[PDB]
């Protein structure tokens, strides 16, 4: 297990400094980084594991219309730090993270070209794999919704985490 450490503090936003009396805490945020994935069934929630049928893709537009579809993080242009903090003794095998890109086309790689790999870290050796904080560039000239799709796969068991964050990336 683990949780998002940076950018920002969402706890600070929930706090009375929002003004003094009002708030927009988005309290669905208790454990979203730790969104589990299981091989086989059950899932408790609705079906996941649907990537080869693309039920979790073409049908996953409904997941981008879900009650559980928590909030867009607003980021202006330039690089930002993205850091996760963990309580894991668990052995990762690999983690990698993508953004969606708008405007897919069936005549083209659509189930891959839905996205862009924005970074990857395999479990291998050196302080390169040890890095748990990474800096990602945000274009300075564009505005638009994206989802970060991230996977954090575990060597220790056939089950993993698979997690998403909606964002709204904008200009400098
Ligand atoms: Cu855990």
């Amino acid at each position: 297990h683990g949780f998002i450490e940076k950018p920002g503090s969402r706890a600070a936003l929930c706090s009375e400094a929002f003004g003094f009396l009002n708030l927009n805490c988005g309290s669905v945020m208790y454990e979203p980084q730790s969104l589990e994935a299981k091989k086989g069934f059950p899932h408790s929630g609705p079906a996941d594991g649907q990537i080869a049928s693309a039920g979790g893709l073409f049908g996953g537009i409904l997941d981008q219309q879900s009650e559980n579809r928590w909030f867009k993080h607003i980021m202006t242009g330039g690089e930002h730090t993205f850091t996760w903090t963990y309580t894991a003794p668990h052995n990762t095998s690999q983690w990698h993270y993508y953004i969606t890109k708008k405007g897919w086309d069936p005549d083209k790689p659509l189930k891959r070209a839905d996205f862009e790999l924005i970074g990857a870290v395999p479990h291998d050796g050196s302080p390169a794999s040890r890095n748990l904080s990474h800096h990602i560039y945000i274009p300075e000239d564009r505005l638009g919704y994206h989802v970060i799709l991230a996977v954090w796969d575990v060597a220790d068991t056939e089950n993993a985490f698979y997690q998403v964050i909606d964002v709204d990336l904008v200009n400098k």
Side-chain angles (χ1 to χ4, degrees), residues 32-113:
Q33 194 279 310
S34 286
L35 185 64
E36 301 183 333
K38 192 187 186 84
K39 274 185 183 186
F41 281 96
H43 291 298
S44 206
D48 170 30
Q50 300 200 304
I51 296 157
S53 50
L57 304 168
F58 283 97
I61 296 180
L62 282 61
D63 178 76
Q64 297 175 60
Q65 295 296 314
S66 178
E67 186 196 356
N68 302 330
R69 191 202 75 190
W70 70 307
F71 33 87
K72 292 193 294 304
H73 206 103
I74 299 171
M75 295 259 74
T76 49
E79 52 178 49
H80 294 270
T81 315
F82 288 96
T83 304
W84 289 353
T85 177
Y86 284 80
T87 53
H90 315 300
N91 300 292
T92 313
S93 44
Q94 186 181 281
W95 63 295
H96 57 200
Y97 28 90
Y98 309 84
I99 50 162
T100 54
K101 63 177 180 189
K102 203 179 185 184
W104 61 34
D105 185 351
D107 197 52
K108 287 195 180 66
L110 187 163
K111 296 171 292 184
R112 297 182 69 191

